[PDB]
Amino acid sequence: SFAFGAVVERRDELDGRPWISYPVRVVADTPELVAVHLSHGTRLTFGDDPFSWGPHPWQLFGDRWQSAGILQLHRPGRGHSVWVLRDADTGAFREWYVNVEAPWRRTPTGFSTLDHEIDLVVPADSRTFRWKDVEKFEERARIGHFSPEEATAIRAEAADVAREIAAGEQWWDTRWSRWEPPAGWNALLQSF
Numbered sequence: 001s002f003a004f005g006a007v008v009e010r011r012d013e014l015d016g017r018p019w020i021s022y023p024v025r026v027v028a029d030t031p032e033l034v035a036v037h038l039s040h041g042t043r044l045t046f047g048d049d050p051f052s053w054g055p056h057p058w059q060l061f062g063d064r065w066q067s068a069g070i071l072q073l074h075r076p077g078r079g080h081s082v083w084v085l086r087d088a089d090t091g092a093f094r095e096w097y098v099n100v101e102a103p104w105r106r107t108p109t110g111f112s113t114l115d116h117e118i119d120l121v122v123p124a125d126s127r128t129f130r131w132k133d134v135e136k137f138e139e140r141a142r143i144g145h146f147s148p149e150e151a152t153a154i155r156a157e158a159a160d161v162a163r164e165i166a167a168g169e170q171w172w173d174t175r176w177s178r179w180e181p182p183a184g185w186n187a188l189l190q191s192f
């Protein structure tokens with residue numbers, strides 16, 4: 001288990017290799033929570049083409065994290081994480097972003113996952129949320145980016161969190177939306 005402020009890899013692994021990989025700072029690493037911090041300016045490392053799913057979509061923006069920094073929150077065993085998203089101009093908390101993805105696994109350099117296209121967008125202090133990229137996911141399932149078993153399990157995952165949020169029973173502490181990084185927790189440029 002990793003120390004507070006340790007710099008580790010967070011990777012989306014596709015085709016047996018890193019589709020994207022970037023350095024993050026550990027905020028928590030416990031049996032109930034893995035939280036990590038992706039800082040504004042951090043270098044994003046993309047694997048070389050071709051991938052079965054095309055270039056990672058974040059190459060549109062280039063090879064740094066352009067927005068405000070984010071906290072990723074992840075409950076071990078579960079098929080998503082929750083991102084704390086802030087306004088890049090004002091720094092104000094805008095929303096919870098639920099990224100549906102493979103349950104994270106620990107690697108010798110940090111953690112590995114894979115985005116599973118389905119996303120939930122939750123306004124501050126709200127049980128109403130917006131489904132994002134559902135139809136995009138279903139098309140990608142149709143053409144075989146995910147097998148039927150995987151697609152079944154992604155939809156179940158996503159429906160699970162959607163119900164908890166709408167019930168007002170979000171697994172995570174909502175005080176994370178006001179958490180502030182220590183000073184000097186700035187851009188990280190290393191590549192794994």
Ligand SMILES: Nc1ccn([C@@H]2O[C@H](COP(=O)(O)OP(=O)(O)O)[C@@H](O)[C@H]2O)c(=O)n1
Pocket residue numbers: 044057058059060061062063064065066067068
């Ligand atoms: N290199 C990057 C890529 C994405 N991002 C952030 O991620 C957001 C979404 O990028 P995206 O290609 O995933 O878009 P959608 O999944 O919202 O369609 C951007 O609007 C930025 O806020 C970034 O800050 N720096």
Ligand SMILES: [Mg+2]
Pocket residue numbers: 057
């Ligand atoms: Mg996206």
Ligand SMILES: [Mg+2]
Pocket residue numbers: 098099100115116117118119
């Ligand atoms: Mg996603």
Ligand SMILES: [Mg+2]
Pocket residue numbers: 116117118119132133
């Ligand atoms: Mg998506």
Ligand SMILES: [Mg+2]
Pocket residue numbers: none
């Ligand atoms: Mg999109």
